[PDB]
């Protein structure tokens, strides 16, 4: 039974990702988040061990649930007549990166470096496990404020990672690459790198660079905040119009702007506590 293993709390929010409640696992008072997804809204389905048919989101979370990482951990799930219920780990205290940037404004580069580094490791983890997130954005990043650790959430737009072209997309348009806008085609890793350029600009300038299709495809990055030349270069490299001109994850993490990152605990003590 699901209502006897967890005490359900207030609604945290709802959207294209379903409805998410705060919760507590009764056995050990572990804080959890309880996500409800309507079966009629699930576009992509998968099968797991023993071929049980589940939402792709459950398949993807199981593949990245391996151990500890910068990804939200799926603890359990249940099928109901018209929905699936997902039990997720819940950091406390927590704030998502969108609200954080709204309240702080443009982040100091030392802080953006630490956050961006942890997002890179998280996305590398997903790709290592065969999972493409397809919706990297500040809204989909939780900050564990006491530990200074970032966690990726909301895999409901993701897919199994492949090397052939993708022709479907349900992530966030203002983070999607110009080859999607123009041709409704993209490849996984290069599209992910584009969204990471959007995210890095978002961090160091206080908001995303583009709102309209014409801006996404136009290929001009105007900096609205003082940003070091090394960071501008990395951003512009990630936002190369031609996908093959974008850096690999290795080239991002080897970029001069990315060196000497703070540890998560240092990040919390210096910038979050």
């Amino acid at each position: 039974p699901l209502e006897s293993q967890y005490q359900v709390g207030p609604l945290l929010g709802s959207g294209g990702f379903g409805s998410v409640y705060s919760g507590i696992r009764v056995s050990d008072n572990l804080p959890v988040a309880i996500k409800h997804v309507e079966k009629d809204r699930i576009s992509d389905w998968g099968e797991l061990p023993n071929g049980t048919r589940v939402p792709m989101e459950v398949v993807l979370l199981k593949k990245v649930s391996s151990g500890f990482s910068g990804v939200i951990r799926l603890l359990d799930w249940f099928e109901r007549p018209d929905s699936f219920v997902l039990i997720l780990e819940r950091p406390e205290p927590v704030q998502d990166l969108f609200d954080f940037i709204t309240e702080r404004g443009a982040l100091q580069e030392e802080l953006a470096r630490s956050f961006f580094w942890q997002v890179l490791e998280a996305v590398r983890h997903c790709h290592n496990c065969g999972v493409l997130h397809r919706d990297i954005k500040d809204e989909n990043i939780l900050i564990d404020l006491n530990r200074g650790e970032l966690k990726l959430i909301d895999f409901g737009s993701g897919a199994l990672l492949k090397d052939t072209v993708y022709t479907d997309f349900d992530g966030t348009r203002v983070y999607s690459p110009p080859e999607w806008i123009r041709y409704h085609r993209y490849h996984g890793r290069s599209a992910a790198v584009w969204s990471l350029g959007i995210l890095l600009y978002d961090m160091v300038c206080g908001d995303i660079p583009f709102e309209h299709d014409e801006e996404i495809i136009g290929g001009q990055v105007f900096f609205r905040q003082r940003v070091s030349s090394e960071c501008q270069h990395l951003i512009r490299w990630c936002l190369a119009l031609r996908p093959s001109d974008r850096p690999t994850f290795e080239e991002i993490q080897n970029h001069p702007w990315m060196q000497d990152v703070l540890l998560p605990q240092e990040t919390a003590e210096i910038h979050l506590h």
């Binding site: 959207g15 294209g16 809204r41 809204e139 409901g156 349900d170 348009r173 908001d207």
Partner: peptide, 9 residues
């Protein structure tokens, strides 16, 4: 300048 969330899914 208006900063806003954007839907997905």
């Amino acid at each position: 300048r208006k900063r806003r969330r954007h839907p997905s899914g």
